[PDB]
Structures are given as structure tokens and as C-alpha cells.
Design a protein around this ligand. Structure first.
Ligand code: ZN
Length: 46
């Protein structure tokens, strides 16, 4: 019974969709638009 949630990445927001990098999260969101496709009724936010 011990918590083992380690987090190792980068100080910069990385797109889990492709693996890009964006200093400002705001930018990432704008880029994510390129991934938007598998949605017809916007089930989840993003
Ligand atoms: Zn991406």
C-alpha cells in the first residue's frame, strides 16, 4: 500500500496526440485542432 505516481516529462506542454511541444499551453490547444476528427457530438472537452 504505497503511492507510486511518478511524473517525468518537461516544463513545456507536449501534445500527447502527436508529441509536439508548445511553450504556452494556449498554443497546444490551437494545434490540437489538427487532431480533432474522431468527434461528431463533442463527447468530451478539448
Ligand atoms: Zn498534436
Amino acid at each position: 500500500g504505497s503511492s507510486g505516481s511518478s511524473g517525468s516529462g518537461e516544463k513545456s506542454h507536449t501534445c500527447d496526440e502527436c508529441g509536439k511541444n508548445f511553450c504556452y499551453i494556449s498554443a497546444l490547444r490551437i494545434h490540437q485542432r489538427v487532431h480533432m476528427g474522431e468527434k461528431c457530438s463533442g463527447p468530451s472537452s478539448g
